[PDB]
Subunit: 46 residues, 4 copies
């Protein structure tokens, strides 16, 4: 549901923010595209 | 290829890396990050 | 600032230094000589 | 005399050659200008 999606979306967004903060890109990169689908599924699932 | 040159690019890169990261451009963010790693060590040898 | 770049200038300088020396231009001959000294050590760190 | 000068001239010229060969410039440089005067004194003293 939009609720979970909105849920997942912010979840990764904090991980993504966190890694990058520790210069841990890569993960930063993977989480970043994960967020890419979900946004889409969101918009889809709305 | 002096400590001064090194420090210059070294500190320059430090911003660019961060800047990309800000725009979610990792990868680059990462490559610049390991560039700096060397660059550092180089500097310590030019000294 | 890679081993390849280093090796290149490093080996280039090696001739120039010698070349001057040939024309009695020491000093330069000497400065290039200590340049190479660093350059060497740098290379060993870029590796 | 021209003889000694000619003598000294080659003496340094071999030292000069030798140092440079071992990359010992500086000396190479000092001996080099020593040779500079003697040539002159030669030409003078002839």
């Amino acid at each position: 549901s939009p609720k979970a999606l909105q849920q997942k979306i912010h979840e990764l967004e904090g991980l993504m923010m966190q890694h990058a903060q520790n210069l841990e890109f890569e993960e930063a990169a993977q989480i970043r595209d994960q967020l890419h689908q979900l946004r889409e599924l969101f918009i889809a699932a709305s």
